[PDB]
Design a protein around this motif. Sequence first.
Motif, PDB file in Angstrom:
ATOM      1  N   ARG A 170       0.833  -1.206   0.000  1.00  0.00           N
ATOM      2  CA  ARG A 170       0.000   0.000   0.000  1.00  0.00           C
ATOM      3  C   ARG A 170       0.862   1.248   0.000  1.00  0.00           C
ATOM      4  O   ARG A 170       0.464   2.298  -0.488  1.00  0.00           O
ATOM      5  N   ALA A 171       2.045   1.124   0.572  1.00  0.00           N
ATOM      6  CA  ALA A 171       2.964   2.236   0.641  1.00  0.00           C
ATOM      7  C   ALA A 171       3.520   2.613  -0.732  1.00  0.00           C
ATOM      8  O   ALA A 171       3.458   3.777  -1.129  1.00  0.00           O
TER       9      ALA A 171
ATOM     10  N   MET B  54       1.127   4.084  -2.929  1.00  0.00           N
ATOM     11  CA  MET B  54       0.852   5.435  -2.451  1.00  0.00           C
ATOM     12  C   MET B  54       1.779   6.462  -3.083  1.00  0.00           C
ATOM     13  O   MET B  54       1.604   7.664  -2.900  1.00  0.00           O
ATOM     14  N   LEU B  55       2.760   5.996  -3.838  1.00  0.00           N
ATOM     15  CA  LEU B  55       3.690   6.915  -4.465  1.00  0.00           C
ATOM     16  C   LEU B  55       3.337   7.160  -5.926  1.00  0.00           C
ATOM     17  O   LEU B  55       3.852   8.087  -6.544  1.00  0.00           O
ATOM     18  N   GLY B  56       2.445   6.333  -6.466  1.00  0.00           N
ATOM     19  CA  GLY B  56       2.050   6.463  -7.861  1.00  0.00           C
ATOM     20  C   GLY B  56       0.616   6.905  -7.946  1.00  0.00           C
ATOM     21  O   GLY B  56      -0.058   6.937  -6.920  1.00  0.00           O
ATOM     22  N   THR B  57       0.139   7.235  -9.144  1.00  0.00           N
ATOM     23  CA  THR B  57      -1.240   7.698  -9.278  1.00  0.00           C
ATOM     24  C   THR B  57      -2.169   6.881  -8.388  1.00  0.00           C
ATOM     25  O   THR B  57      -2.310   5.674  -8.572  1.00  0.00           O
ATOM     26  N   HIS B  58      -2.787   7.548  -7.413  1.00  0.00           N
ATOM     27  CA  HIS B  58      -3.694   6.893  -6.468  1.00  0.00           C
ATOM     28  C   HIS B  58      -4.792   7.830  -5.966  1.00  0.00           C
ATOM     29  O   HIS B  58      -4.767   9.038  -6.205  1.00  0.00           O
TER      30      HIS B  58
END
Lengths: 218, 237, 237, 119
Positions: free
Chosen positions: D26-27, D30-34
């Motif tokens: 999930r982390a 969380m750094l890419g398109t989300h």
Amino acid sequence: HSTAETTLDSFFSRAGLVGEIDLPLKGTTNPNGYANWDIDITGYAQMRRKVELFTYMRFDAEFTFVACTPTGEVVPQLLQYMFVPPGAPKPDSRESLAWQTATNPSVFVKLSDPPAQVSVPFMSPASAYQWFYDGYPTKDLEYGAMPNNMMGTFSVRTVGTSKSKYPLVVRIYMRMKHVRAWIPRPMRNQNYLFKANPNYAGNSIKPTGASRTAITTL
Amino acid sequence: VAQLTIGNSTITTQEAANIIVGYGEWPSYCSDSDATAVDKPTRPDVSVNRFYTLDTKLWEKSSKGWYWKFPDVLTETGVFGQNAQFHYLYRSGFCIHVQCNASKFHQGALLVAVLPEYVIGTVAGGTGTEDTHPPYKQTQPGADGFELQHPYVLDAGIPISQLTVCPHQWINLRTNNCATIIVPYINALPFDSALNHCNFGLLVVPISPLDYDQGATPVIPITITLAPMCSEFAGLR
Amino acid sequence: VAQLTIGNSTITTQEAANIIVGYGEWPSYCSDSDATAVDKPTRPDVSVNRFYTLDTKLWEKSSKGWYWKFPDVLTETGVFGQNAQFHYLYRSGFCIHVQCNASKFHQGALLVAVLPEYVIGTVAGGTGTEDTHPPYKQTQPGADGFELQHPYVLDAGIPISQLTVCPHQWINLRTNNCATIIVPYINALPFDSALNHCNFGLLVVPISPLDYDQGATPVIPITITLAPMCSEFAGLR
Amino acid sequence: FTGSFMATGKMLIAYTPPGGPLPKDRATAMLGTHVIWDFGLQSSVTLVIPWISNTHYRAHARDGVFDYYTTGLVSIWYQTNYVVPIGAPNTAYIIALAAAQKNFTMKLCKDASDILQTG
């Protein structure tokens, strides 16, 4: 109707004793008739908790020197109080050429001459002496060590080649002038354990203040 | 309700509760006539200044409190943890947002505040005669944060009953879930090592214990989304 | 909230959710230059165009779905079931309204749609080798409606995962209870037998199963109130 | 979200563009398109898939098929757990609907079907 007493400068002025030097004749204590006192403002007990109300401060400090013998007596002895700014080298012996370096201000005063008095400025290279540091200077024994808070060193000594003829005691007072402060923080409620850190006694954790029996009996 | 987007990061939040602008100042930039006018400090706009949503900590009856260090929480994470390490100096601001997702049947209160130079003082051996320096996992706990052990003295020998003297905002479950704060760069210097010095620390402690009758979900997912504001770097390596 | 009245029929409903006007057209009338300008088609206003509130079907976890045929649902009922039978031709529109009465503690989702020429294809014997024509109780189920048996293929060999291609509206219990639709007369002809031909069919299937903890009422009364719009008849018998 | 109305929480629905590998957790997602979806605030959320193109020609078996390779990826993570008070079902279902934007297009008719008219 006035509120000037509660201003920072007001709250902090007053010369407080922050240091005492013993230069006995017979002793284990400062056997070479000289002494080095890196300037610590925590010398005045009360002071540590007062300043630690803030995170950043700035100020000048007027020092006054009171010297005499243990019985509080006055004598015909000359003295050299020397200030070795931070960076300069402290005298290692009663004849270290550091005593002669011009860049180490020195003020000579006879014990009889009233207290010598000088103003020292905001030394620190940082824009403010800061009481807390959440990091390490570029588990480590260097945590919370804000270095750039050095005010200098005060080297005291009887003047002359030979040991002084009397037992001497210098006292260093310090008035804090032109005080400015930032970022206020929770008053220390736990007893102090060391000069460097906020380390408290995890066993003896005491309620901030007095207690009572019930929340209904006053 | 209404959703806001800063790049590829899209969080769903409430219209606009009352935000707390720490010390009334807005994380602005540092003008040209500073100490390094030679090595122009590049100001990350693109993706560097976007929404980071951290591993949601779970609230319990027994929770003591939690704290993260800044900029430590991110020097690990993403493309800001890229600049924080391979760059010599740093100055930044932070739009911190803390949310709770709990029903009208759980009760509690969270105090959320920011404390500059949050220096963790450990217990010191117990009796007080051990000069133990907190580990590196307590001094800079990453984005997982860390649990206070002595919330009453904030693990630093200071009453928390006074922490409200710092920028803070409350999260009473019966009145609000979201709490937001804006932090301006604060330090005795215009720039500073983003690795060796944690300008501040985010503290979120449960002041009124979480409670609920049997049956209601026993944990409250506290989601901390935060983003850099007018952040600046200088001197690549 | 606010209550509306069309004659002697007074239903209590919400201010005005989003109505769905099937194919953007409004059930209008048929002008003078049509195929029967001799036998003026009398347009029932009085009581003929009022609120009919059908036997509320009860939702369950196990419900498959329900469907009614039009104008079949009314050719039985009232003073419109009077004209639908003793009249030779018919053209009508329909303000259909579907409501649920459930607490904020039940959960579910109902897809409500209208499908023209809804021809029910039965199972066909099982193995596929029986050319069984659905009974008359399945082809025209009256105002009691009928339960799909194979909701996935809408009892007609067509995926329901695609039914949204017809006029539809959703009834998510956590967002709404009422769902409304306006249907314009639709057929390859200007008029048609109101008994031998069901222009369309009302379909209301539970897509997200009804659920609730033990204790909450196990059924959700789905009330279908509907009324004719710019309806027309011709040729008494 | 078609669950009880008393439920809240957050989901992290991330899109990993064609080529990009499913985020490990999930982390990293969380750094890419989300998008953090709080089905506690809004019952619905819509995500746009920027682009997909089925045009790269593949002559595999012996049957030349025009296939994607643009397999974008939509992942969905529990940003927080599902918080529901007593008296509300501990399971909700979610329906996902799909459609193509207006910038969509098709080319080259190719009648094909498993279901044809029987004898």
